[PDB]
Design a protein around this nucleic acid. Structure first.
Ligand SMILES: C[S@@+](CC[C@H](N)C(=O)[O-])C[C@H]1O[C@@H](n2cnc3c(N)ncnc32)[C@H](O)[C@@H]1O
Lengths: 94, 106, 98, 82, 328, 76, 98, 87, 107, 94
DNA sequence: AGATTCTACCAAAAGTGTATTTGGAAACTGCTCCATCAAAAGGCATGTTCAGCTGAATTCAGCTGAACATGCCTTTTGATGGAGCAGTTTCCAAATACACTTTTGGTAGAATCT
DNA sequence: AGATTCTACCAAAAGTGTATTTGGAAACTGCTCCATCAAAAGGCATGTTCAGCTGAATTCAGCTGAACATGCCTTTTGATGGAGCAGTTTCCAAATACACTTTTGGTAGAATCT
């Protein structure tokens, strides 16, 4: 039964940042754990945010506030800009 | 058809992130931009750690990132260290650090 | 007969172990310990190999970080020798005893 | 010669852990204290892992049972799934 | 009676009104007086010798009587200097630059004589192009020592405030023009007056000033986009101007061609940024970022220096990254 | 039909194009050899912005002419 | 004139305060500190009175518990006087600065 | 709305006797003179952290009033769960 | 008719708990016995804390339970103290506890 | 808008254990926080548990395991008996 | 030994198209409660004096731990039957979905208790 | 002053009653990968010697507690304007809900590469 992971996407990012750098299996498994962990923290925080405000919907806005609550200073600022940029780009496309 | 990831200019899978959000029981509904924003955040954080990890592999004269490098990158970075303050990176070891009072009196 | 002074080799070992990442407790004895503890919660259990390894990676990282805090406590009391009361102080402040 | 299992965590193994932890000199009483501390740590984590094992109706403790146990104990571990 | 301090190179005297103007309990007219005379005695030895006579050295800031004797002798000394200089003695040259200690006094007087109510400058809502951040004499000095302003530069201060950064720089250095534009109604009104008090006083001490205009205008105006492209020294305050404000500025900086410098309260991209064009927000891909030396003249509410960053445009780096991939 | 494409590091890369070639094909030729993204690439000649989907004949790009490649950033 | 010896009244104060539950920091001054800090984060905020009391109950519980740990650190060093290094060791072991 | 006094140096409202009292509840018998400033610094960090998150919840809800619940949620996020205020 | 609480022999509201479980987004489905089991546990834990807090109140010659009594009950009970190890009971104060070395005299 | 609380149920239980003992409003507020807190903790542990096992249903069995994971020794034992008893009774009544 | 490259297979996803459903924004507004000014006064904060006794320094000797040489037993490594972890198929107890009908926890307002 | 005592109103609950849907227990079973044994392999246990650390004993400068005089500013009691939180209705932009076509990530096996 299929076992999904972020491995292939982590690898694509690695190549963008360090074209001639590889990553071992154990390291990749660590990165997969990292992505799943941050996904759960951000999602849980967004979930609580919507419930606190009695909203049925988790939108980009709850994801944004979740990011500002969870990530340290500079990391939050860049994550927010990266997220905003992607939703802009995405929204502007037939 | 163009993948939502490509439309967002992302490497991470928007479609999968949307699916994971829906089935994670986080809310009754999930707006269209949420999985895009979240995927972008996950991609960015991933790039940040791989960027510093790769640099650590380099300083160590290695071309392949192993757990040790992820640990060195995270623990030497103030922000990543706090984000992962309660996380243990398997096979990471610790940062070289000896309390000054323990050094011999040269 | 050459002889390093007390402490010289200790310092050498700190440098050596802080550079590496291999586990420091031997595997089989750790595995036996794990199985014995688990048998008290549920008899006739099996363990995936990765389950024991995860327990060892977590247990070792826990003890190593606890030793760091223990060391700060001994140093706080103007010593360079860790003692049981240092581990106890660290655990109490961490809230593992508190 | 027999051997109590927790005694299998030997003085040398404990000293190595202490060295990685930056420790230069160790009191003889540290070894037993450490064993006691390690046992409590394992009892707490294993108890929860086995609780997940039993809930899943399994007879085998999986890495995931351990990962989930560590996570709820505030000891999140990366590298073994999850 | 009033109190006048007669110009030491006979050009546009300083006049202080009667009754004395008190601004706050840290600035009165008299304290300015004492510092002006102090500096002129230090510029010209012969006047110092004379101020000793007819003043008992018992003068004080809060009584007129005490001030009226100090002015009268001083004005009597200035008449002696012009007769001295009218003969065979050579006077001072009006092509001299003010020292740091003197220049500090001149900017301080010009503030006090314009701003007669500082509270009004403190009126801001944050995350707006109107935050009047804490700018210091010392911060502008780090700027003057560290990068040197030449006649092959142009200075523009976007979000100028009163405009004390531009004016300080003009007394000390010279460029083709120096500009200051700030959007806020309150600081602009003050800035116009500041320009006037500042010009009257530079000529009063006989010191060359550079060309400047402190303008009422919007610094984010689309008019500036082409002007910025021709401007190679930008100072831009961004204390808490907000990301939104910062972004729009990052788009406009792109229009600068090489050799430009941008001093801002933040990195636009890391000091230790990796080259490879990846950013979709940052313009700090064509420019190296390094930290200008920390302050003690600004102190935030956190109680730790406010740091400022120098960016130097060198697109040579991005282009080289690409070049490496064509080799061997 | 020969062209030079100048970066401001004073590097000229020669491309062998024909005048029937679009701007979009040229930028693809620059990407092949230096790994440069088309959107980030702004080719300027004679105070005109060379816009994608335009033959080279249109901009009076002939043999041994120097085109200026200025970058920009973009994204979004 | 009568005088309790140094430490006697201190012990009396410990018993008195460990017996009661009222907040120990003056209320208005604490409210101003909260407003000052909040204002530097975001201008024009208003506060429900219970929001300020909640912050005060939490801040005092946090400080009392930190002084307990600090005290243990001083005693660990054979002192009865708490010092900045005790608070710092306590916060470091707690992971507040680690 | 006209004026609104400037708030500054209110950390000094956390006085030496108040800090002494808090240490007494914490069982402390003797206190070095440097403890007061150290404690103010620690309290400021604690408050900045909780208030930052509380206000983040306030802004997200698009309110201008920080509620007891914004504080309770902020405290909970930080592992300092507080009972008694709706949380 | 009869409440699900009466059918289960509980004081706590099974209906309410079922509803709260559904609205909380814990799972796509919530079985009928879940809220019964949960209401029962909540009821049991509240019985336990009130038993001990009323005793603390009696010990202090009071007839009304106040936060201090809830705190004495929780902090003097090993298990409740652990369950609420990271919880602050407002107006609870702390347990009287003076470290030995701080007491005067000797012996 | 009506705001619910466990107050009347806490009061009923108070009366069963200590018939002549009352409770102040602030203590009742603390008891209401306690019940909500444990409800969320148990419900969250149950949610994760079900997700970990790819189950879309939270049954009394997930609540029981969540209770065992969350509660210290003796409290878990007694909570388990009370919940089991409540369900067995519930299911016998219809 | 473990990471990389490549061919082949395909249920699982994910994207597009169609129609219905609906959360929650703007719009208007009732009404709580927050900020603020007032006045009074005493609970406490401040600042000082005085000296008890604590922390910090110095000295020193007992003895515990570190370093190390000597020798074997527990651990590590590699090979092999099955205990069950899972993938598949079957089937109903039990969980949505939906329309009423009835019961009940809040709660607004006034009154007397404890 | 705060709490438990009643009256009346009731929308939001909670419960009772058919129809329809389906999650996952249960049984059978194939394929892992776990437990266990044999032997090739790499520390650990143990006693000796003494360096240097811990902690006891001693001393004293001066910090910090205790007591006190003085009076500031927090606390308390009240009132009031109105910012803004929160209730109510309207109504579309965006989400859920299938149904269908396409692409894609994961898995398995083979073999070369680093
Ligand atoms: C920190 S103050 C500057 C103080 C002065 N420049 C200094 O360095 O001391 C920032 C100024 O930026 C101005 N500002 C913000 N956005 C602006 C815009 N778009 N155009 C012009 N000025 C703007 C504000 O009005 C504000 O006075």
């Amino acid at each position: 039964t299929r076992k999904e992971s972020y491995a292939i996407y982590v690898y694509k990012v690695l190549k963008q940042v360090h074209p001639d750098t590889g990553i071992s299996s154990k390291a990749m498994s660590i990165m997969n754990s990292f992505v799943n962990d941050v996904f759960e923290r951000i999602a849980g925080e967004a979930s609580r945010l919507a419930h606190y405000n009695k909203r049925s919907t988790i939108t980009s806005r709850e994801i944004q506030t979740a990011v500002r609550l969870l990530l340290p200073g500079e990391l939050a600022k860049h994550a927010v800009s990266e997220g905003t940029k992607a939703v802009t780009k995405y929204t502007s496309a037939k | 058809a163009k993948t939502r990831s490509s439309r967002a200019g992302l490497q991470f899978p928007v479609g999968r992130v949307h699916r994971l959000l829906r089935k994670g029981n986080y809310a009754e509904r999930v707006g269209a931009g949420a999985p895009v924003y979240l995927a972008a955040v996950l991609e960015y954080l991933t790039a940040e750690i791989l960027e510093l990890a790769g640099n650590a592999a380099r300083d160590n004269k290695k071309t392949r990132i192993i757990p040790r490098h992820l640990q060195l990158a995270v623990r030497n970075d103030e922000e990543l260290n706090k984000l992962l303050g309660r996380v243990t990176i398997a096979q990471g070891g610790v940062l070289p650090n000896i309390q000054s009072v323990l050094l011999p009196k040269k | 007969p050459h002889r390093y002074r007390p402490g010289t080799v200790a310092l050498r070992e700190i440098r050596r172990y802080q550079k590496s990442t291999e586990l420091l407790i031997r595997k089989l004895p750790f595995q036996r310990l794990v199985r014995e503890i688990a048998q008290d919660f549920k008899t006739d259990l099996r363990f995936q190999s990765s389950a024991v390894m995860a327990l060892q990676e977590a247990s070792e990282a826990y003890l190593v970080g606890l030793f760091e805090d223990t060391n700060l406590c001994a140093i706080h009391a103007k010593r360079v020798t860790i003692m049981p009361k240092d581990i106890q102080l660290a655990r109490r402040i961490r809230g593992e005893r508190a | 010669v027999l051997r109590d299992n927790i005694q299998g965590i030997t003085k040398p193994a404990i000293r190595r852990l202490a060295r990685r932890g930056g420790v230069k000199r160790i009191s003889g009483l540290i070894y037993e204290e450490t064993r006691g501390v390690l046992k409590v740590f394992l009892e707490n984590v294993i108890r929860d892992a086995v609780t997940y094992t039993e809930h899943a109706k399994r007879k085998t403790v999986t890495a995931m049972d351990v990962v989930y146990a560590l996570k709820r104990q505030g000891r999140t571990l990366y590298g073994f799934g999850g | 009676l009033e109190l006048r301090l007669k110009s030491p190179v006979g050009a546009e005297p300083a006049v202080y009104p009667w009754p004395l103007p008190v601004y706050d309990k840290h600035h009165d007219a008299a304290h300015e007086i004492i510092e002006t005379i102090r500096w002129v005695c230090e510029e010209i030895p012969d006047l110092k010798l004379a101020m000793e006579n007819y003043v008992l050295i018992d003068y004080d800031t809060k009584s007129f009587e005490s001030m009226q004797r100090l002015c009268d002798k001083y004005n009597r000394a200035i008449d002696s200097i012009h007769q001295l200089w009218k003969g065979t003695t050579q006077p001072m040259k009006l092509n001299t630059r003010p020292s740091t200690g003197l220049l500090r006094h001149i900017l301080q007087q010009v503030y006090n004589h314009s701003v007669t109510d500082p509270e009004k400058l403190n009126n801001y809502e944050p995350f707006s192009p109107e935050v009047y951040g804490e700018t210091s004499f010392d911060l502008v000095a780090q700027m003057i020592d560290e990068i040197k302003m030449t006649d092959d530069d142009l200075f523009v201060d976007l979000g100028s405030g009163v405009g004390q950064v531009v004016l300080q720089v003009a007394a000390a250095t010279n460029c083709k023009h120096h500009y200051g534009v700030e959007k806020a109604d309150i600081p602009a009104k003050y800035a116009e007056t500041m320009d006037r008090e500042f010009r009257k006083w530079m000529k009063w001490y006989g010191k060359k000033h550079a060309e400047y205009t402190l303008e009422r205008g919007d610094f984010l105006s689309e008019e500036w986009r082409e002007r910025i492209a021709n401007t190679s020294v930008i100072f831009v305050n961004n204390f808490a101007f907000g990301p939104e404000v910062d972004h729009q500025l990052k788009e406009r900086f792109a229009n600068m061609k090489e050799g430009g410098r941008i001093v801002s309260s933040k990195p636009f991209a890391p000091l230790n940024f990796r080259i490879n064009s990846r950013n979709l927000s940052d313009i700090g891909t064509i420019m190296r970022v390094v930290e200008l030396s920390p302050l003690k003249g600004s102190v935030s509410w956190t109680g730790k220096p406010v740091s400022y960053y120098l960016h130097t445009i060198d697109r040579t780096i991005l282009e080289n990254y690409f070049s490496s991939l064509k080799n061997p | 039909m020969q062209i030079f494409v100048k970066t401001l590091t004073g590097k000229t890369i020669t491309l062998e194009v024909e005048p029937s070639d679009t701007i979009e094909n040229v930028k693809a030729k620059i990407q092949d050899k230096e790994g440069i993204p088309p959107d980030q690439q702004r080719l300027i000649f004679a105070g005109k912005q060379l816009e994608d989907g335009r033959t080279l004949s249109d901009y009076n790009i002939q043999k041994e002419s120097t085109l200026h490649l200025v970058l920009r950033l973009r994204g979004g």
